[model samples]
Target: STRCKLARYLEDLEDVDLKKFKMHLEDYPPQKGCIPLPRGQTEKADHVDLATLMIDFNGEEKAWAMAVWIFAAINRRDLYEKAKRDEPKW
Candidate 1:
């Protein structure tokens, strides 16, 4: 089950264009075969990885939504504080 999900996920990733998502990685250079991200890094890389997966497998809306959600959740406190600090003094 896990392997199947992984395969499907990779297949989805392969279908999407990297440019649309503003991916700044290595351009996703061609490799001999399907290359997977390290399991350990997957957790930390959820936002980008999931965005790529959604972009390829799902669609643009979901992909962007996920990206936004992930980033906001991961950096909520910082974002909130920054927004507060940046508010207009009027």
Candidate 2:
């Protein structure tokens, strides 16, 4: 899965590179439909949503998180399972 490969790539990054990756997040905000954030009535939001946004905006090419969440949202576990096999070793 592209997500697994991306995870490995990110894991291989040095601190400096990771910093750059975080910076990239700041430069681009996740699209509205990418993941749901907290509503006005809510005091907190799901951390997974943030992670999904990060993957959606930056990891489009190999957006594993995005794909997984999207599949789960639509009830596509089979595809999700196939993709998850490429999970990166941490």
Candidate 3:
């Protein structure tokens, strides 16, 4: 079975910092025009719905960027490995 990208990177990070992500949530009054949800309960918060809404809406964007970062990091590390790999010749 294919492990999800977020899950894989999470493991690679050796324990991800979810608090950091969840630390971006906040709230406010309703928008300029009534579009959907109601109540218009003026609200405020911090680092609340990040992990949840983000995971649903922008999770893939972050995951994709993270994957790229991981891939690039591995390549950079491989410079050392490749260097060692060619040590006998060098």
Best by TM-score: 2
Collision pairs in model 3: 23-47, 24-47, 25-47
Question: What is the C-alpha local distance difference test score of candidate 1?
Answer: 0.35
Tens digits of per-residue lDDT for model 1 on 1-90? 222332233333322332222242222223523232333444344444543544464344433333333324444444334434533332
Give the per-residue lDDT of model 3 (tens digit) for 39-88: 12212212232223334433444423333433344443432343334332
Q: Which ten residues in a row have the lowest lDDT in candidate 1?
A: 18-27
TM-score, each model?
A: 0.29, 0.36, 0.26
Candidate 3: count of backbone clashes, pairs at least 3 residues apart or interchain: 3
The candidate with the higher TM-score, 2 or 3, is 2
Q: lDDT by residue for model 2 over 1-90, one digit each (tens)?
A: 444444444444355544444443343236634433233211121234434444555455435555454444445565457557755543
In model 2, pairs of residues that clash are none
Model 1 residue runs over 4 Å out of place are 1-51, 76-90
lDDT sort, best first = 2, 1, 3
Cα shift from native, residue 45, model 3 (Å): 18
- What would the TM-score be for candidate 3 when compared with the true structure? 0.26
